[PDB]
DNA sequence: GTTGGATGGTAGA
DNA sequence: CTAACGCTACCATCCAAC
């Protein structure tokens, strides 16, 4: 059984710098810009010149701004790396049609078909890096392993442009080597309570009852790690399948105003609902990022489908539900739909 | 007890 | 306006309901 992981490099701006190739060598970040104010907004990526200067996807804007002037700031264009994703994922569809699309950027590929061998796999992985290049002249780092947490975890190693095999002997070593805060699903939070623990490795993971682990990491997350540190983790690359679609914005300005509040509302419904396509969600929740960046979030199950129109009008219940319940000023008013039918 | 929805935490693209 | 985007997936947990 082998995975192949793609993870497209410094991917948007990437794709800037393949679409305005005199951006290649220099700075770029691309940037969400919130609206609030001139340069509001946060860096979605830079490339690795800008992140020689910590310029990384979530600074803001103005801090990347005041690190690194000179760079080629570019307003996130979400659609054109969309665009640029799917005919990449497409390539690798013509590598293995079992692919699991992870995100805008990554697949992972079951090839255990394609290839014998982690040999092959690595061939493989470099025929996959050249025809994006050819095709796409984006580079991607591949990882490839005995399952999709141990490619993720080659690729990390690799990135930027690189290729990584973990056989199985370095699985292995890396359950027993390798910081468990660098497996895929281990942040900062898990992280901080597996070394209250003492757990620093996958390795101990096994060196530990699982309630107690459980009891600090949680039932899944205990049982995902427990699984890698015993070379178990099979799960299979799956097609994968949007469970919710939302959209969410920053307001000019922070408002508790339903009537100032609610055209970002609509237009989040709009543009979720447009996002939507043909899917049909039972589930519809408004959420507000608040003044302080908390997300608070009101939501609601209908049996059936909701219309746009339904959509509307429960967001707004929901939105009304968000301001009455929370005394906070909303900065950020989104919607995200999901239970599609 | 246990679903499953509401809501939030966490991780990550 | 004065930094903190927007997006999804998964899961914990509370609580009402079953
Ligand atoms: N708006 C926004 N987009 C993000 C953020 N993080 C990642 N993305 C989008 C932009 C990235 O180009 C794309 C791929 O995610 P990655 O974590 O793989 O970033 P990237 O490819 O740029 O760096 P790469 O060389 O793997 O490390 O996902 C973020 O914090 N905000
Ligand atoms: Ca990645
Ligand atoms: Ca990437
Ligand atoms: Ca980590």
Redesign the pocket.
């Given at each position: 059984g082998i995975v192949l992981f793609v993870?497209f490099d410094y991917?948007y701006a990437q794709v800037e710098e393949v679409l305005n190739p005199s951006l290649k060598g220099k700075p770029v970040v691309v940037?969400?810009?919130?609206?609030?104010?001139?340069?509001?907004?946060?860096?979605?990526t830079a490339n690795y010149e800008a992140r020689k200067f910590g310029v990384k996807?979530?600074?803001?804007?103005?801090?990347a701004k005041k690190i690194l002037p000179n760079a080629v700031y570019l307003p996130?264009r979400?659609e054109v790396y969309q665009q640029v994703s799917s005919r990449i994922m497409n390539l690798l569809r013509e590598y293995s049609e079992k692919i699991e699309i992870?995100?805008?950027?990554?697949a992972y590929l079951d090839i255990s078909d394609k290839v014998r061998d982690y040999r092959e796999a690595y061939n493989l992985g470099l025929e996959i890096k050249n025809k994006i290049l050819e095709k796409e002249k984006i580079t991607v780092t591949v990882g490839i392993s005995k399952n999709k947490v141990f490619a993720?975890i080659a690729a990390?190693m690799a990135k930027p442009n690189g290729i990584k095999v973990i056989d199985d002997e370095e699985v292995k070593r890396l359950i027993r080597e390798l910081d468990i805060a660098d497996?895929?699903?281990?942040?900062?939070?898990?992280?901080?309570?597996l070394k209250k623990l003492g757990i620093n490795k996958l390795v101990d993971t096994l060196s530990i009852e699982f309630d107690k682990l459980?009891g600090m990491?949680?039932?899944?997350?205990?049982?995902?790690l427990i699984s890698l540190a015993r070379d178990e983790y099979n799960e299979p690359i799956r097609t994968?399948?949007?469970?919710?679609?939302?959209?969410?914005?920053?307001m000019?300005?922070?408002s508790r105003n339903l009537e100032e509040i609610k055209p970002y509302l609509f237009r989040?419904i709009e543009?979720?609902y447009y996002?939507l396509d043909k899917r049909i969600p039972?589930?519809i929740?408004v959420?507000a990022?608040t003044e302080?960046?908390?997300?608070?979030?009101?939501?609601?199950?209908?049996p059936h489908g909701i219309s746009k129109e339904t959509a509307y009008s429960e967001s707004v219940k929901?939105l009304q539900?968000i301001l009455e319940?929370?005394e906070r000023k909303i900065?950020?008013i989104?919607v995200?739909f999901?239970?599609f039918i």
């Open positions: 993870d991917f940037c969400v810009f919130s609206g609030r104010f001139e340069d509001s907004g946060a860096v979605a996807a979530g600074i803001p804007i103005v801090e996130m979400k992870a995100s805008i950027d990554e993720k990390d497996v895929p699903g281990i942040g900062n939070i898990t992280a901080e309570k459980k990491i949680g039932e899944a997350k205990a049982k995902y994968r399948v949007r469970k919710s679609i939302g959209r969410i914005v920053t000019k300005r922070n989040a543009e979720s996002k039972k589930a929740h959420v990022v302080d960046l908390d997300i608070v979030s009101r939501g609601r199950t209908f929901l539900k319940e929370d900065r950020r989104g995200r999901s239970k």
